[PDB]
Each structure stands twice: as structure tokens, then as C-alpha cells.
């Protein structure tokens, strides 16, 4: 009722800017997420007992994978919270509640393998969602967890705002689908320039949330250099393996999952940054100019890759 949580000060005070990292000691991570809803929704959006119970589920359903992992997850809802508190304002109640869960949760049971590898094994999830395949399956995962016993975090929103909240989590979690990504920023693009762009027209609000779901995602790239370097090991340590995935069926992965084009890694993440990054957090910025920090430290995190090419580290 009366219960606060708080963070020790360091966390307290670096929670709040864009770069946070959340450390190293996973017994912490629900207590930042919990720290961070109550901040971002007020202490009254959940009851705490069912949030708890929530949290440490959805916990349990991300596996030990190099990258897709618990950490992944606590780390694009802190972004997310970085977002919704620099756009107070901007966004409804049902909004703030279902977005932090939608990263939370925008991930849940990933086995380390693109849509890609599931299609080319023929995994079963590829024959019952043929596009965005995991992310149905997470969405799929998310419905499951607030169906158990004591989950239902939602059960206090009435039957039309629970619909309106489980709307938002799914379009949230499918817009992570990076192939979505691209057609979704040039029609963001497109609209912000010409003044068509409208955040009363719900299709707009949605691309817009779509967005900042990728920005959320990928905000490994806007970290302190120490971290953005050792998430990298990270995500290739999977993208390599589903190469290796990839030659046992008799296939050539990409250059990105090839373990035998390490020597180019620098290269490809200049490509990244340059085809992927930059323009995610250029367009959010220009629709949410307070989210500008973003795209500093993505610059600056580019600008780390080019040093390393030159042989300056
Ligand atoms: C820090 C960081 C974050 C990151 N996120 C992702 C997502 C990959 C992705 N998924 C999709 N889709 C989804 C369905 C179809 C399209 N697309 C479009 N992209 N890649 N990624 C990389 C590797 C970048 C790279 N590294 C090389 N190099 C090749 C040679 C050495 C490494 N390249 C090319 N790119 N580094
Ligand atoms: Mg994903
Ligand atoms: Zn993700």
C-alpha cells in the first residue's frame, strides 16, 4: 500500500537518463522494473503481488541465450521508460501500463535464432506464423503468462481497456519485427515533413509506439562504448551460432552470422549504424525532440566503430 521502491542513489539518479545500464546483478533487474513502473504509471497501475508474480514468469520464460535474454528484456523497458518520462504528456495511461510490459515481455522464449532459421528448418512456429514468426510467438507467450492464475496484472481495466491494452502490447511487440522497421520509418519520414503526421489519428500513434519499439531494441547502440562493445560480442556469439545452424543445413549463412567474417565485424556495424541506426533515432528524435540524447550517443557510438577500422583501438 504505503511501499515505495527505491534505489541506492547512483541507480536512483542514472536510472533516469538514456544510457543507464542496469548492471550485472539480475536479483536487481525486477526491483528496476518495478522501481520504473511505479515512476513511469504511478504505484496503483498493478497490484504488486500480481506484478511480482508477473515479472518472475515472464523471467522464467526467456532462456540462457548469449543476447535474447532476461537482461535484453529489462534493458529495452528502461529505454522505454527513459522515452515515457522525457514525453510525459504525450501518451495515455493504458499506453504507459501496456508499453513497459510490451518490452518486458517482446522477447519471451526466444531461442536465439532469426525468423529466418525457423523458415529454413521448418521449425513448427514458421507452419503457424508464417511472417514476424517469434514475434507472434512472443505476443502468443505474453497472452499465455496473464491467463495464469494470480498473473492477470490487466484484471482491475475494464473489458474495453483491457482490449484496448492487449492492442497495443501485440502491435508494440510485432513492430520489434525488424523487417517492418524500414517501411515504417520512411512512412513516419514522409509524414513529419509534408505535416500530415497527426497524433490524434490512432494508425499514426501506433507507427509512431512502432518506433520507439525499434529504438527500445536497439539501444545497445546508444550505451556507454564499454557496453556497446560487449553487447556486440554478445549478439554475434548468437547471429555466429545460427551460422554455424545454417551450414549444418547446407546453406551459406550471410556475412552477419558468418563466425569466418570476424576480421569485417567493424565494417558491418558501420553499415548497421549507417542503414539502421541512425535513421531510427534521427526520425524519433524530429517526432520526439526530447529523445535527441539517443542519436548523440549513436553518433558517438559510430564514430567509436571508425576509430576502431583506423587502427586507433
Ligand atoms: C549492435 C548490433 C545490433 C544489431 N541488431 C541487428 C538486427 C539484424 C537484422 N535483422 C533484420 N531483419 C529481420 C527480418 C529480416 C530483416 N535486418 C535487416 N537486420 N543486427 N545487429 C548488429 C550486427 C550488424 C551487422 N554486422 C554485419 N557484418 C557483416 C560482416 C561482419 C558483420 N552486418 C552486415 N550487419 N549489431
Ligand atoms: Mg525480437
Ligand atoms: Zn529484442
Known amino acids: 500500500g504505503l511501499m515505495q521502491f527505491t534505489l541506492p542513489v ?5 536510472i533516469e537518463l538514456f544510457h543507464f545500464d542496469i548492471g550485472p546483478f539480475e536479483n536487481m533487474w525486477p526491483g528496476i522494473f518495478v522501481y520504473m513502473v511505479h515512476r513511469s504509471c504511478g504505484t496503483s497501475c498493478f497490484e504488486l503481488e500480481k506484478l511480482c508474480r508477473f515479472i518472475m514468469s515472464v523471467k522464467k520464460n526467456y532462456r540462457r541465450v548469449p543476447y535474447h535474454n532476461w537482461k535484453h528484456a529489462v534493458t529495452v523497458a528502461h529505454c522505454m521508460y527513459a522515452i515515457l518520462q522525457n514525453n510525459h504528456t504525450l501518451f495515455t495511461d493504458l499506453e504507459r501500463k501496456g508499453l513497459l510490459i510490451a518490452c518486458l515481455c517482446h522477447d519471451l522464449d526466444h531461442r536465439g535464432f ?3 532459421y525457423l523458415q529454413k528448418f521448418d521449425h513448427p512456429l514458421a507452419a503457424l506464423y508464417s511472417t514476424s514468426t517469434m514475434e507472434q510467438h512472443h505476443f502468443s507467450q505474453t497472452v499465455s503468462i496473464l491467463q495464469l492464475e494470480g498473473h492477470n496484472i490487466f484484471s482491475t481495466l475494464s473489458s474495453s481497456e483491457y482490449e484496448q491494452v492487449l492492442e497495443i502490447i501485440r502491435k508494440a511487440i510485432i513492430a520489434t519485427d525488424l523487417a ?6 520512411k512512412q513516419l519520414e514522409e509524414m513529419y515533413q ?3 503526421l497527426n ?21 545497445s547502440v546508444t550505451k556507454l562504448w564499454p557496453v556497446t562493445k560487449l553487447t556486440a560480442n554478445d549478439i554475434y ?15 551459406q549463412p550471410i556475412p552477419m552470422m558468418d563466425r569466418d567474417k570476424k576480421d569485417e565485424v567493424p565494417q558491418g556495424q558501420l553499415g548497421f ?17 526530447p529523445t535527441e540524447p539517443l542519436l548523440k550517443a549513436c553518433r558517438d557510438n559510430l564514430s567509436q566503430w571508425e576509430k576502431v577500422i583506423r587502427g586507433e583501438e
Open 194 to 196: 509534408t505535416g500530415s
Open 114 to 116: 532469426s525468423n529466418s
Open 10 to 14: 547512483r541507480l536512483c539518479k542514472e
Open 273 to 289: 549504424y549507417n542503414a539502421v541506426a541512425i535513421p531510427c533515432y534521427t526520425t524519433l528524435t524530429q517526432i520526439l525532440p
Open 199 to 219: 497524433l490524434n489519428n490512432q494508425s499514426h500513434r501506433d507507427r509512431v509506439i512502432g518506433l520507439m519499439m525499434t529504438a527500445c531494441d536497439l539501444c
Open 237 to 251: 556469439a548468437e547471429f555466429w551460432a545460427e551460422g554455424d545452424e545454417m551450414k549444418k543445413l547446407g546453406i
Open 180 to 185: 517492418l522497421y524500414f517501411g515504417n520509418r
